[PDB]
């Protein structure tokens, strides 16, 4: 109505007293005044976020009621590309879509649209095509192949098609099967990529940059110039004006790390990510999705798959004196039991690093080096917040005096990514 869309990253909620408050998720603050005080304590709830997001998604009435597609299962990717990118009005895709498979053969997954989304997600997110490549830490999470242009001549068009399909999945309530690294979702949100975010992108770059961050680079005799092995011929690039003859020292460290990350990761995938976002936003402006975090954005796109805590517990190995009968371990599992399904998935993302659970269960759970199981290691003083390592699926759980303290600390850590 006359009020208009809320500013990006804002939400409106109804209090039990009936007065409506406004929550800024970027700063995590509640207020009474309309954006266009204490109010209620901030509570990041994915269910209410999703309800608000779906409510503010409005289907145009001018478009045809039904969006009809005919595809061949042998190569679903190609006909899907042709049909979806042949549409000049993206709003037509906002209309309900019924994908009549060839000869109505079947193979449904509870819905022909869901079956189409499943098979297409299998096809697009296969690194064989070259658009995407498996993450460094995991073997199932994906990322944009920086060399995607070399393999595919029209990689930008295919990335736009993938973005359009993802936008369709989010808009229509269906779910995609591909899980991306955290920097992927951060680049959707327009957030800043940090050194930790490189853990998924490349192990060599992350390890070298971490060494530089912690130790004095003066031993390495580093300049503000990096060598671009990619592209024909090997040549040096200055990260800052007069990069050569400028030496990386303790005062020039974080600037060097930021510039190296920008040149070697962000600059390389920026074009492909921009094409993906251009395809994605044709059905959902970024402002609506900016309320979600990267973790919540992953859940919104790939869905909230219920996690069986019994299988999770049985196929878990404890470390540093923790035992299944240990009071802290069973208290932690009690806290996991009482916590919601979305909170359980957020705990998975906090420790494992992704919401994907292997189809065989938690026995096949992987890691940076290889097959690695969920680990809960004793570490730190009781007061400290739990920490997580997603390269080895490790939760550094301090020994907690009582169940209530452990529950509160674990919830605070899970909520604060």
């Amino acid at each position, epitope marked *: 109505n006359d009020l208009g869309p809320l500013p990006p990253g804002w939400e409106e909620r109804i209090h039990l007293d009936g007065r409506t408050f406004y929550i800024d998720h970027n700063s995590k603050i509640t207020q009474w005044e309309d954006p266009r005080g204490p109010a209620v304590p901030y509570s990041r709830e994915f269910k209410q976020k999703y309800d608000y997001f779906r409510k503010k998604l409005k289907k145009p009435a001018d478009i045809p009621n039904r969006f009809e597609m005919k595809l061949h299962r042998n190569n679903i990717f190609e006909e899907s590309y042709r049909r979806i990118m042949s549409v000049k009005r993206p709003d037509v895709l906002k209309a309900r879509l019924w994908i009549e498979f060839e000869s109505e053969k079947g193979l449904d997954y509870g819905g022909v649209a869901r079956e189409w989304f499943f098979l297409l997600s299998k096809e697009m997110f296969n690194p064989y095509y070259g658009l995407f490549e498996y993450s460094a830490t995991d073997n199932y999470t994906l990322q944009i192949n920086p060399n995607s242009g070399l393999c595919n001549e029209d990689h930008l068009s295919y990335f736009t098609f993938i973005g359009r399909v993802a936008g369709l999945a989010v808009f229509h309530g269906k779910l995609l099967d591909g899980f991306f690294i955290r920097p992927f979702y951060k680049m959707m949100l327009g957030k*800043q990529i940090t050194l930790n975010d490189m853990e998924s992108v490349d192990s060599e770059y992350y390890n070298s940059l971490k060494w530089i961050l912690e130790n004095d680079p003066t031993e390495l005799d580093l300049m503000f110039c990096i060598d*671009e092995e*990619n*592209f*024909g*011929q090997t*040549y040096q*690039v*200055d*990260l*800052k*004006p*007069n990069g050569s*003859e*400028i030496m990386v020292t303790n*005062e*020039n460290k974080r*600037e060097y790390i*930021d*510039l190296v990350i*920008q040149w070697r990761f*962000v*600059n390389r995938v920026q074009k492909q990510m921009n094409a993906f976002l251009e395809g994605f936003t044709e059905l959902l402006p970024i402002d609506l999705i900016k309320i979600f975090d990267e973790n919540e954005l992953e859940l919104l796109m790939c869905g909230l798959g219920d996690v069986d805590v019994n299988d999770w517990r049985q196929h878990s190995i404890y470390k540093n004196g923790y035992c299944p009968n240990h009071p802290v371990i069973q208290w932690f599992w009690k806290a996991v039991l009482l916590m919601d399904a979305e909170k359980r998935i957020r705990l998975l993302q906090f420790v494992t690093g992704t919401s994907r659970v292997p189809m065989n269960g938690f026995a096949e759970l992987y890691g940076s080096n290889g097959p690695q199981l969920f680990t809960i290691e004793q570490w730190g003083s009781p007061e400290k917040l739990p920490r997580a390592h997603t390269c080895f699926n490790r939760l550094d759980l301090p020994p907690y005096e009582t169940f209530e303290d452990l529950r509160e600390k674990l919830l605070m850590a899970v909520e604060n990514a």
Partner: nanobody
Amino acid sequence: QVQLQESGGGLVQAGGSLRLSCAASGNISDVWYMGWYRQAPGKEREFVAGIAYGTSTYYADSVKGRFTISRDNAKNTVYLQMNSLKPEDTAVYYCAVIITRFVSYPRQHTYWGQGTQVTVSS
């Protein structure tokens, strides 16, 4: 090609404020780094401030706290404001830009300003 000209540079008492503006002309497609450099009498050029990408701003430890670097997109002009100015600040202030141009492989083109003598009186 891009050409830079720095103005706003004049002798000022120490503890005075100087703003240096880098007027940039030409096709500034995508600036990788907008920096202010300093050349003291008898010394090589040394980094003073940098805008780099987005809004991340990097300062030299000598000028950290005292100076502030900003960019105006409509004018594409960078302003370095120096406060608590000191004799060390007396050097000649250049303005450099790096434009990442993509022909075959993407490469960095560095364009340097003429410079303004900024001095401190005390």
